[PDB]
């Protein structure tokens with residue numbers, strides 16, 4: 001079982017020096033990721049949410065960042081689900097070398113994917129029952145909407161900062177989740193793609209080119225397309241789907257709109273209506289190898305205080321990247337904050353993948 005350090009270096013340029021930040025929050029007991037339904041024999045007992053924020057630096061300059069949320073949902077002193085929600089991924093082009101951002105991300109997901117679900121449960125206070133890893137349903141959800149910046153304010157400037165476009169960006173993640181499906185899930189895992197830009201048979205035309213045999217247009221919350229959105233759509237942070245659901249609660253329509261019309265109406269919300277190409281990817285299956293990794297001090301650093309967490313992360317999402325000064329400052333601040341208030345050095349690693 002590899003470490004984050006082993007995973008990373010394995011996909012970063014050969015013999016090159018990089019240092020990374022693996023910031024995790026303290027597992028928290030919060031509300032159901034999906035609005036509960038009274039007429040449902042099943043209503044979750046516990047929904048443990050926790051955030052993973054990663055950062056990669058190259059010679060004192062941060063150039064990439066990934067914001068991921070993991071939801072561990074427990075139902076009947078036996079059943080459990082772990083949803084890995086990819087929220088934000090951004091670059092700022094300030095690394096003197098060229099790296100495969102597509103690969104870094106995939107590997108960071110393979111890592112988060114290998115974390116034993118009880119790792120999050122044990123940290124929760126008071127103690128929360130433990131489920132069996134070999135049989136926890138695992139899901140990945142992501143919403144691809146290309147943008148200027150997401151974690152690095154104003155990095156849009158920096159002449160050389162590749163920014164994919166809706167479609168380009170949709171084939172990028174596509175490649176990643178496909179690679180994950182192939183080497184991490186079982187032969188019967190649900191793999192869904194849905195582009196509310198329409199062309200139902202155009203999505204199909206694209207999925208044909210995937211390696212995993214089971215991609216299908218659709219999402220992983222839609223079973224019976226006539227069910228009510230509210231009881232099936234998950235409400236993630238800063239997510240477009242959640243946005244629409246709260247709109248639907250203003251207009252007292254929650255009880256009226258079905259999943260079917262939900263997607264049809266989701267597009268015209270100014271978030272779409274032609275404006276850029278957005279897609280919704282989803283995976284729901286069982287891991288190939290049962291997850292049993294418990295992150296170390298080297299794999300993850302967990303500031304003990306939601307405040308201290310927000311502080312460290314602020315040092316990245318709070319800079320000015322209209323210039324390379326920000327990339328340098330972000331680095332400095334973190335390395336310095338770590339070494340001076342947590343007695344910890346940014347994990348360092350030499351590349352390893354040839355060309």
Ligand SMILES: CC(=O)SCCNC(=O)CCNC(=O)[C@H](O)C(C)(C)COP(=O)(O)OP(=O)(O)OC[C@H]1O[C@@H](n2cnc3c(N)ncnc32)[C@H](O)[C@@H]1OP(=O)(O)O
Pocket residue numbers: 086087088089090091092099100101102103142143144145146147148149150161162163164169
């Ligand atoms: C979780 C979410 O849904 S978030 C939404 C996505 N986020 C955003 O749009 C935020 C802004 N966007 C970005 O910061 C960037 O576009 C990113 C992070 C998405 C992409 O970063 P990149 O550096 O482009 O990715 P990576 O290095 O893996 O691939 C780009 C390289 O692949 C190559 N490439 C170009 N076309 C292709 C292709 N069809 N197939 C494979 N490789 C290609 C080029 O080398 C390109 O390098 P360039 O930057 O000199 O043009």
Ligand SMILES: [Hg+2]
Pocket residue numbers: 093094095096097098099
């Ligand atoms: Hg670079």
Ligand SMILES: [Hg+2]
Pocket residue numbers: 110183184
């Ligand atoms: Hg794997």
